[PDB]
């Protein structure tokens, strides 16, 4: 009840990209629309995270830090879920007005990364992931990437992460063992994908002026101030299993 009640209650609603589906697809248009969508989803991720059980237990600087580091993974995971429930993983459901078919995957020059995301979407089906498991996993995803040097108050974070793992346990509760194994394996699989996208969005920002791709305010800041911490190895994801 309680824990799951909250997660269901705070789950972000539908978010549109504002893409003009009347114009023929193009690299600059598609990626710019994705960037706008990302900015819009970031606002929802912030509202969502600040409302999570026990989030205020974290030092304020850590609250902002984990959101910024986990942003990509959170979006990827939710998108995969949306693609699974809406189009049964046939296409990438970024938004109602921004659905990626093979042609767009190609036109966006993000084909390889889209293939990875589509595979993740397919796993929700192959694993018969329930909406309740999805909710708990996504919440745990927010607490799955931290600085190797530690956070301002690592202890409050460790405590919070531990409790979310316990909640996943309960939702699951030799079948419990196997379920926990595949769900943690699934969660781990998000990280390599998020890294690929981190590299891609970083390179895109650096050359955005040359390819006519627009980056919203917060995104440009986060991608140039925080993401490089991840790409340079200062900030790393927390894996359940050894990669």
């Amino acid at each position: 009840p309680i824990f799951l009640n909250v997660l269901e209650a705070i789950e972000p609603g539908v978010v549109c990209a504002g893409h003009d589906n009347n114009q023929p697809d193009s690299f600059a248009a598609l990626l710019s629309s994705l960037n706008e969508l990302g900015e819009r989803q970031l606002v929802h991720v912030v509202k969502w995270a600040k409302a999570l059980p026990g989030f205020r237990n974290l030092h304020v600087d850590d609250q902002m830090a984990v959101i910024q580091y986990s942003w990509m993974g959170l979006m990827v995971f939710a998108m995969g879920w949306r693609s699974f429930t809406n189009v049964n993983s046939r296409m990438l459901y970024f938004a109602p007005d921004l659905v990626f078919n093979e042609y767009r995957m190609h036109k966006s020059r993000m084909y390889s990364q889209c293939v990875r995301m589509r595979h993740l979407s397919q796993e929700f089906g192959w694993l018969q992931i329930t909406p309740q498991e999805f909710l708990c996993m996504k919440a745990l995803l927010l607490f799955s990437i931290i600085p190797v040097d530690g956070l301002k108050n690592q202890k409050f974070f460790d405590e919070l992460r531990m409790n979310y793992i316990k909640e996943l346990d309960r939702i699951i509760a030799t079948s419990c063992s196997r379920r926990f194994y595949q769900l943690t394996k699934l969660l781990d699989s998000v990280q390599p994908i998020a890294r690929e996208l981190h590299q891609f969005t970083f390179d895109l920002l650096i050359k955005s002026h040359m390819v006519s791709v627009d980056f919203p305010e917060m995104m440009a800041e986060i991608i140039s101030v925080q993401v490089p911490k991840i790409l340079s190895g200062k900030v790393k994801p927390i894996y359940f299993h050894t990669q």
């Binding site: 912030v46 910024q68 917060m218 800041e221 986060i222």
Partner: peptide
């Protein structure tokens, strides 16, 4: 500080 501003506005 674009993110912190958002963070503090919601």
């Amino acid at each position: 500080g674009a993110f912190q501003n958002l963070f503090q506005s919601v």
